[PDB]
Amino acid sequence: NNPAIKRIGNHITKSPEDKREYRGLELANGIKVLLISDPTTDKSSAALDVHIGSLSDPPNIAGLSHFLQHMLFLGTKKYPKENEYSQFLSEHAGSSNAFTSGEHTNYYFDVSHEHLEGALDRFAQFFLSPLFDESAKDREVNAVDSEHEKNVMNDAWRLFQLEKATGNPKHPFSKFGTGNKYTLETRPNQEGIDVRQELLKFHSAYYSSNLMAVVVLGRESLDDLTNLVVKLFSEVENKNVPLPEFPEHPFQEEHLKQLYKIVPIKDIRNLYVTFPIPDLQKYYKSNPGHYLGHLIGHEGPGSLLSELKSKGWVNTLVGGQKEGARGFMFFIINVDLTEEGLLHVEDIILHMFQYIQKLRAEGPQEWVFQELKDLNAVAFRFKDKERPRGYTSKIAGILHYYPLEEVLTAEYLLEEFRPDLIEMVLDKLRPENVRVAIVSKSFEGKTDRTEEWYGTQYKQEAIPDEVIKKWQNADLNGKFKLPTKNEFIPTNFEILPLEKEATPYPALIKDTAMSKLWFKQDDKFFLPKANLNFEFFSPFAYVDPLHSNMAYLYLELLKDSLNEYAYAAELAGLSYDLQNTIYGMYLSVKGYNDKQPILLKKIIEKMATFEIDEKRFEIIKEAYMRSLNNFRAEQPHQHAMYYLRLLMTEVAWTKDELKEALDDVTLPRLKAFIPQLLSRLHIEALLHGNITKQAALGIMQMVEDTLIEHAHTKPLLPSQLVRYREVQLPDRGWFVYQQRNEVHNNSGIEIYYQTDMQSTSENMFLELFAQIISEPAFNTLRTKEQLGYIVFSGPRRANGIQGLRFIIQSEKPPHYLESRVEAFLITMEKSIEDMTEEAFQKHIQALAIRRLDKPKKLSAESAKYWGEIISQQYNFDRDNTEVAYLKTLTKEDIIKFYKEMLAVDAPRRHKVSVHVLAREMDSNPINLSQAPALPQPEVIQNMTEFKRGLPLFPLVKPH
Ligand SMILES: Cc1cccc(-c2ccc([C@@H]3[C@@H](CO)N4CCCCN(S(=O)(=O)c5ccccc5C(F)(F)F)C[C@@H]34)cc2)c1C
């Protein structure tokens, strides 16, 4: 009947555990639509995906489609205010973002479930009448430039664009996708281009309804959402744009049998092997490329990685199909190299072709296909409920590739066993079709080429024909065997009934000297999974730099030894996480609860009886040295956060201190360390999920008994369980710590206004003030003043203390950012005074909606509890309590808080600043609002002297 709708789809196949309701349809103008109705959801969400992207950029205006993405947020005919969209979401508990790929531009948001329609209306105008204001165009070009700048010294981005640069230059694959100030302004200016014209030209040409997919999720009925979407999106005009296709591969014959030697910024050794392949997307029900990726990339007994590890040549390997665009794809194998491996790349590649040859020898394996199929089937059935914003964005993209009825299952369920396709793809993994890239600092000075956009330095050689032949003649290596049946595949999915004494929050069910056990049986999600979290306390994990190094290497070596065994468990939905902390060790086991005790028992047994392979020890130690050194290449703003974390924590070892001590770590000393670390411990655990109190008590005691049997562990004394405190800053003080980033030509800054110990009152004063200023700070500091791509504000919480923080990465010097942030804070004092009383309550309700947002998957609820436990506050009802108090706050209360704690002349202002200067700054001391004059800062010359010159805060009292 309805003329606005071209069709309604049939039942949209979903998991029987999914309680959400789905309708799919195609609009008259061709928009493909999925509607998701979830009456429980706290946040509603919508996303739109356009099947156009950087591959469609005009060759003379690189990055135009990425630039157009940024511009749609900045105003439309119906809603002209540059920030009406941001502001509307902020005051209704929303967020938004977008990304541009070669073939897609994806826009998405979430918001309070009551304001879906208000958000969606503003959002629809992006695709109807965008302004492309000239003042916004001039300002936003800078945001794009600093984003590129951030990427210039990043080894991944350099490799990403280097690949495009070494293929057919006539192919759109070569296009620079990001854009920068040169491609978007300075160069188009000297060629007479009116960019606002090209934006409107491009938007009008390609933003056509026939290339769009929309997904909307909210509490409304499926019928109500249907009316809503036709109301807002039928207006979008249909220009029947043909969908771009790229049938000719970017890598032709002249681009094969090629070797590239590349100089990295970080000290890394990597080998990249690539084969051009046809587009396998159409074969999604068969998934031939993923079958091969599963086998080549396997890490278990008999695998290619296993032999390469034993020879001491590589440490990690990943492989499989890599997307390109419609009409072309890649198959890749990525290994990191040891020092020895760098000298044996030829042999390493031979082993690769030997393993591939084994797969040809044995032919396709239906049992392998069956196993992959069964695992994906289990995965889909018990998939965790997704956060709405990410869910709509994902679905919006794949609406372009699968029938409406299959969108939810297309990427999970497998139907066809197709050995013809497996051999077809397998026939393409041959030496005559290969491309090899080596990344090592050993090529420094030996390169003869330079990549235009990032400056990557590299050398290109043809692979010698005799070397190709050795690879082509790869025999069978008897150390390569297909994997055996995966015995970690779960079979028991029974959901145990809720016990009578079950509780809404974690209960303390064991409180001994050795262990504190918090337990909760799942009463929400009812999936056959569980989370097992353990914190191991030992003073010897962080006593000095040397011991910290050894705690790290111990767990790295242990994970290395378990890798072959645990890989099967990971494929089977059973994964673990094990790393050292400043307080000891952290262990998490997540996944299907069926075979979970088996993996946990194997981990603890291995810890307590660990034998170190000397060859593995030397290799991992070398990698760890490089990892420490490679911090020099992180981004300025991350340095600033690192430095501030060192300044404000009672105890903290620097990367330099760790580097020095790493040389004094001998194999004998490590062998002695491990038994000393395990000799005395305290264990605090959260066991949460599809398990009962008896099972949980048994799991916790199994861990203890294993440690007692093999490591003779005894309890710690309670006075030994000590937490670190935060430095207490003086009233009206201001300290600055200054450092230089020697890799990146940007500067970074973090500003911390310390308030007081966490407290129900002090917590919500800060959080509410943070909410009020969140959007304005971004609008003022980024979109208006265009200081940098990275502009952040919000609460900082550490060691029981809290405060307000600003983080900026910019080309301008830090002392300038200091004033602009100081100028902004006064704007916020007036803005709070002038704002209406309902505008204020609007923020209160926005913060409330955020805090009370219910977790949708077990892992998220577990995280909430775990944060209460590791912080030793144990405030499991915090959300209800704090929101209740928040609602009673008044505009008067926030002004007093600002006047007392944050204002420039506040009697209790505690300000500490970290300035990370850019690579090229030697030193460092209109239309914009006026900044207050600031005092003379006390320049921190030594972090140790700084800390001992000041008091230390107390620790928070447990609930
Ligand atoms: C000159 C030349 C020749 C041959 C190849 C490359 C190359 C191409 C591309 C790269 C990119 C680089 C960023 O551009 N990325 C870094 C981290 C590893 C991430 N991935 S990946 O890990 O290989 C991968 C990606 C997608 C799907 C599956 C996989 C899989 F795991 F299955 F293999 C690619 C790698 C590097 C060199 C280059 C640059």
From Swiss-Prot:
It comes from Homo sapiens. The modification N6-succinyllysine is found at residues 150, 655. It comes from the Eukaryota. This is Insulin-degrading enzyme. Plays a role in the cellular breakdown of insulin, APP peptides, IAPP peptides, natriuretic peptides, glucagon, bradykinin, kallidin, and other peptides, and thereby plays a role in intercellular peptide signaling. Substrate binding induces important conformation changes, making it possible to bind and degrade larger substrates, such as insulin. Contributes to the regulation of peptide hormone signaling cascades and regulation of blood glucose homeostasis via its role in the degradation of insulin, glucagon and IAPP. Substrate binds at residues 294-300, 317-321. Its main location: cytoplasm. GO terms for biological process: amyloid-beta clearance; amyloid-beta clearance by cellular catabolic process; amyloid-beta metabolic process; antigen processing and presentation of endogenous peptide antigen via MHC class I; bradykinin catabolic process; hormone catabolic process; insulin catabolic process; insulin metabolic process. Changing residue 725 to A: Decreases dimerization. No effect on degradation of ANP. Retains the ability to degrade an aberrant form of ANP, when in the presence of both ANP and the aberrant ANP. The gene is IDE. Homodimer. Can also form homotetramers. The N-terminus is blocked.
